[PDB]
Design an enzyme around this catalytic site. Sequence first.
Site, PDB file in Angstrom:
ATOM      1  N   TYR D 155       3.618  -1.865   2.515  1.00  0.00           N
ATOM      2  CA  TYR D 155       2.388  -2.233   3.410  1.00  0.00           C
ATOM      3  C   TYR D 155       2.316  -3.609   3.735  1.00  0.00           C
ATOM      4  CZ  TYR D 155      -1.889   0.331   5.860  1.00  0.00           C
ATOM      5  OH  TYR D 155      -2.485   1.209   6.771  1.00  0.00           O
ATOM      6  N   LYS D 162      -6.740  -3.593   6.667  1.00  0.00           N
ATOM      7  CA  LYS D 162      -7.607  -2.231   6.060  1.00  0.00           C
ATOM      8  C   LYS D 162      -8.899  -2.243   5.576  1.00  0.00           C
ATOM      9  CE  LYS D 162      -5.373   0.918   8.466  1.00  0.00           C
ATOM     10  NZ  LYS D 162      -5.911   1.916   9.402  1.00  0.00           N
TER      11      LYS D 162
END
Lengths: 257, 257, 257, 257
Positions: D155, D162
């Site tokens: 990720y 995020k």
Amino acid sequence: GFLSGKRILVTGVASKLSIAYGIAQAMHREGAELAFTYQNDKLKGRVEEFAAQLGSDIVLQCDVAEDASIDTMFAELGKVWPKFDGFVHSIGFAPGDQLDGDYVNAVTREGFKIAHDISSYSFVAMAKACRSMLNPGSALLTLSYLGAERAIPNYNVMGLAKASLEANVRYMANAMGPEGVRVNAISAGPIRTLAASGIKDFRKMLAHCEAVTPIRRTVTIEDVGNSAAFLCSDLSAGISGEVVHVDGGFSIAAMNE
Amino acid sequence: GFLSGKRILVTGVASKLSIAYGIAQAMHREGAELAFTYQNDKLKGRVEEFAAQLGSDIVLQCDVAEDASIDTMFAELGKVWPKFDGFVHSIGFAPGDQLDGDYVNAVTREGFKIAHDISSYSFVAMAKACRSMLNPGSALLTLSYLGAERAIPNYNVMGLAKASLEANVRYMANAMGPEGVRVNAISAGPIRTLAASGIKDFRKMLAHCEAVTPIRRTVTIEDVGNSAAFLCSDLSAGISGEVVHVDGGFSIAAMNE
Amino acid sequence: GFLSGKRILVTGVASKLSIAYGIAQAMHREGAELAFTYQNDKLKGRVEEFAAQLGSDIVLQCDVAEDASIDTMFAELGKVWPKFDGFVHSIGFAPGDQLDGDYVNAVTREGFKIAHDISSYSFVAMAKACRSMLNPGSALLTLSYLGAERAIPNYNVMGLAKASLEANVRYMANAMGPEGVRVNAISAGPIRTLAASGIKDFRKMLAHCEAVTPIRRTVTIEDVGNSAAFLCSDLSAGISGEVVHVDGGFSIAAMNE
Amino acid sequence: GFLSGKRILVTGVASKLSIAYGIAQAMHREGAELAFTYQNDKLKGRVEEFAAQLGSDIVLQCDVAEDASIDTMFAELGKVWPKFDGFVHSIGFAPGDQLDGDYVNAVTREGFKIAHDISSYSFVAMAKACRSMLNPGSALLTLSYLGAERAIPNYNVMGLAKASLEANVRYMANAMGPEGVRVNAISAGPIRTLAASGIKDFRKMLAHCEAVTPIRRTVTIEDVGNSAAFLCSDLSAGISGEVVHVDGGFSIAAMNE
Ligand SMILES: NC(=O)c1ccc[n+]([C@@H]2O[C@H](COP(=O)([O-])OP(=O)(O)OC[C@H]3O[C@@H](n4cnc5c(N)ncnc54)[C@H](O)[C@@H]3O)[C@@H](O)[C@H]2O)c1
Ligand SMILES: NC(=O)c1ccc[n+]([C@@H]2O[C@H](COP(=O)([O-])OP(=O)(O)OC[C@H]3O[C@@H](n4cnc5c(N)ncnc54)[C@H](O)[C@@H]3O)[C@@H](O)[C@H]2O)c1
Ligand SMILES: NC(=O)c1ccc[n+]([C@@H]2O[C@H](COP(=O)([O-])OP(=O)(O)OC[C@H]3O[C@@H](n4cnc5c(N)ncnc54)[C@H](O)[C@@H]3O)[C@@H](O)[C@H]2O)c1
Ligand SMILES: NC(=O)c1ccc[n+]([C@@H]2O[C@H](COP(=O)([O-])OP(=O)(O)OC[C@H]3O[C@@H](n4cnc5c(N)ncnc54)[C@H](O)[C@@H]3O)[C@@H](O)[C@H]2O)c1
Ligand SMILES: Oc1cc(Cl)ccc1Oc1ccc(Cl)cc1Cl
Ligand SMILES: Oc1cc(Cl)ccc1Oc1ccc(Cl)cc1Cl
Ligand SMILES: Oc1cc(Cl)ccc1Oc1ccc(Cl)cc1Cl
Ligand SMILES: Oc1cc(Cl)ccc1Oc1ccc(Cl)cc1Cl
């Protein structure tokens, strides 16, 4: 409504101010078939009226302090409801003395035990007593408070009890998930109820909260009721082991001085 | 050492594998004067042995399961340590039956009760009793576990107790701060202790953390020991009501697949 | 000291009020060999002075706003420290206009960009560049703030940058763990530094935390200093990708009214 | 439906697999009047069909990478909608190279900047561009991922982006709350989409997730759509600055080995 075809049990209705009353109204409006329970006799009448108003004739006495009471209650319910879709846990108690002044001074082994027993264990105690009656897609809901995350003056032991509650949700969500049973909890801000009249200097608590809250207002049993309804409906099929904060965003701010 | 001149009461030493043994070890190294308690007669002898090894001869008994046992112990300590600088709470318990299989199926009112009493309540219990004996700059410290934050298989009830524990740290920290008492907790990674023995697939539990742990190894009592010595020293005079994770960053990772 | 034999690169020293000055102070005390960088020529002289005070003569320049400045610096360091044990990242920046009034009204693509670049990216940037130079057992460390966890008035964008920062610590910790590199962060309470100057009602911000802080006082660079020395030593060889709050337990309290 | 009388904008519709498509269907079903936006021309047709199907003829091009694009889009919208009730932010991007292999090795200043700009700033950028058009009781929604809370392999930088996103929600909730604008974010588990085909070894990610998830199944764009609909409706008037995890309880479990 989005609750149509759902049989739900609601515990903790003591007054029209009760958070549970708010949850009931919402769920009823949304098409859910309801059942109610009352702690003792001194609330039989009251709760029996609310139920009638909400089109429900299923009202049973029960006391979480006693397994038997829990066992018996689910015994009668099984007669009309051999299978439902969750229940709402709006239960918590602590000896007054425990909720005032210094925590280290206030807390007692007895008080500590009682608070956790009713405010926490009561939750899994009920689930445990009605595990086989639950349908697939069922949902269990419980109310918590920021006291579980931070040290709030006067809340004292209820804080530890709530912390235990919140972990119970995670442990309950993980265990019953595979059967198709979601377990969540709503963390509501302070509301206008009877039990709060219990906690010391509760009213200043509120005022600070409504002056410093993002939405700039305290939550109603309505705001809490709707989130609860949604949380118990298939609409939230993807959410479990969660503790959504229904406190108009109070916990996420700081120094709004 | 940075613990010199400090007087700390260490609890929980049951064997050379005990985390407390690791804590006492490090603390003694950094030059603190130690005091040890032992749960019962079965343990007395060994604790007395470790006590001697660590230049200590203060080996009192204390079963936190009783308020009479706690008062008498601190009453005995005051004899030689009219005043001291805190204590390391390294106790935890729950009936064996509780740590195996379905949490909901395994849990019981009695089990829930004992776990919360011995594991969570005892911390404050000990604080309540020695409150007046603590010097300004004192530091209390307890051990917790991830089970408090996330539903961990088999850990079951202990998780709830730890959650309550961690809340206790915060409530204790906020109440005693003004008097100059700091309170924190160390959420430690698993370590093969006698207790771990009772936990199912612990040996397997240790294996998973090892490979998926950032630092590719599980922590040691030395690891926890060094951290507790710090948290218990004036070096951390700015850290209070905190839960520092000493698990090699296992918790902050996900899907390390 | 427990930092003896260690070689640490310290950044961010701008004045005697600088948190880094406090860190370098403690580290030197515990016996680590230090290296200092300075942002520009305006600062050079002073850093050189503090460097001398701390038995160091390695005073390189580095503006993390540039990859060329970072490579050249580590290229200069390798000259005398072919290998070292980590570095303390004490840098943060954002255009003044950003830290005043409505967050949404104040924020801008450019501001958001710079804050995130200088404050969040630089951490890993420095890691990327010195990766091969770090000995096993090395430790990287950065400073963060509550603004990362909760919406704090006026802090605005810096909050987002800190959030990204803290995520960086975790992602950095998980990637370098296997090589033996630990990475953590200290979320510190406010301290009247030159930077704090730019922040609105900071002087008021400090006052609120003081009265409502568990330990009834705000932390000092000494407080942060002792903690960073620990987090940067082999004593914390079991703590990685962690954000330890060194704010006297301000964050774990609520409504201290 | 419970969204009747609400004008909502939906961004990010790229395919029938898009999380946004799921949110749209749900909101439409629930009575909401919709508007759509498409990143570029290569999605004009596709998005124009979906809109027609959803009874909407309001489809506008816009690119968050450019203010002007955002300004122009809200310019046209204002012609048909001089005042609406929030929009859905389903936007995020990062150069492929960034999402594969070692994070410390993969991350670049450019990649880091781009990810945060589109995946984070884009959110407040839009809010900023339509602040005066929002009605009282309006709601802004954004999608996040567990990557913001933990270090997930591959990720990488999206994680920091995020994390920044999630803080943006708290900072946005606090600032617009007083006007009567709620800001929340849904943390959805992994779903069957186009962008995920982007992240490395995404498909194993899923499988692990559905085998170890409490509900024992991955979430659908439906599960996410309903929670989104509710979150944007008055039904959730009490919730703001919250990031409800719509990942069937995956984040709250551990070692389900
Ligand atoms: N009141 C608030 O502002 C607030 C905020 C957050 C959470 N909560 C929580 O929400 C829940 C609802 O409380 P409320 O505010 O509606 O108060 P309330 O007094 O209206 O409801 C509490 C209920 O608990 C029931 N109860 C107590 N002990 C029982 C026992 N042994 N057996 C069976 N029933 C028992 C009572 O009969 C009563 O109906 C509690 O868990 C409370 O802590 C309240
Ligand atoms: N072992 C691990 O991997 C791990 C990880 C995190 C936290 N912990 C925690 O560390 C602490 C220490 O446990 P350990 O792993 O060292 O195991 P251990 O068996 O070495 O220690 C347990 C101790 O509890 C004491 N005790 C139990 N009941 C008591 C009572 N009623 N009164 C007084 N003393 C009592 C025993 O005498 C014993 O010394 C516990 O709180 C445990 O939860 C352990
Ligand atoms: N001051 C507080 O109360 C507090 C609380 C929590 C965290 N912090 C953090 O502590 C760290 C240190 O700040 P401080 O309070 O010591 O302030 P300070 O002004 O003493 O330190 C800021 C430093 O950043 C350096 N810097 C800025 N831009 C740079 C660039 N492009 N390249 C290289 N160096 C650059 C400056 O040269 C300066 O030394 C920051 O990360 C800040 O966010 C401060
Ligand atoms: N896919 C998952 O499993 C998952 C899980 C959690 C969160 N999310 C998040 O949910 C959101 C929805 O993504 P998705 O999975 O539906 O993928 P998707 O590819 O279907 O949607 C992403 C959208 O971003 C838009 N977009 C990208 N850059 C843009 C720019 N510069 N300007 C304007 N529009 C731009 C694209 O046009 C596209 O429609 C993202 O934020 C994603 O990170 C996805
Ligand atoms: O938990 C609560 C939190 C708030 Cl703000 C207000 C009321 C609450 O509810 C209780 C508080 C104390 C006791 Cl003894 C019982 C209950 Cl039901
Ligand atoms: O908390 C623990 C966590 C881990 Cl990983 C290992 C051991 C632990 O400690 C206990 C577990 C169960 C009982 Cl009955 C008593 C204790 Cl001390
Ligand atoms: O992060 C901080 C937090 C606090 Cl309470 C005080 C100062 C801080 O530091 C900064 C704030 C703004 C800018 Cl532009 C730069 C820095 Cl170093
Ligand atoms: O955030 C996500 C998380 C998951 Cl599990 C799956 C897809 C996701 O969405 C993206 C991932 C990478 C890029 Cl570049 C863009 C997007 Cl929209």
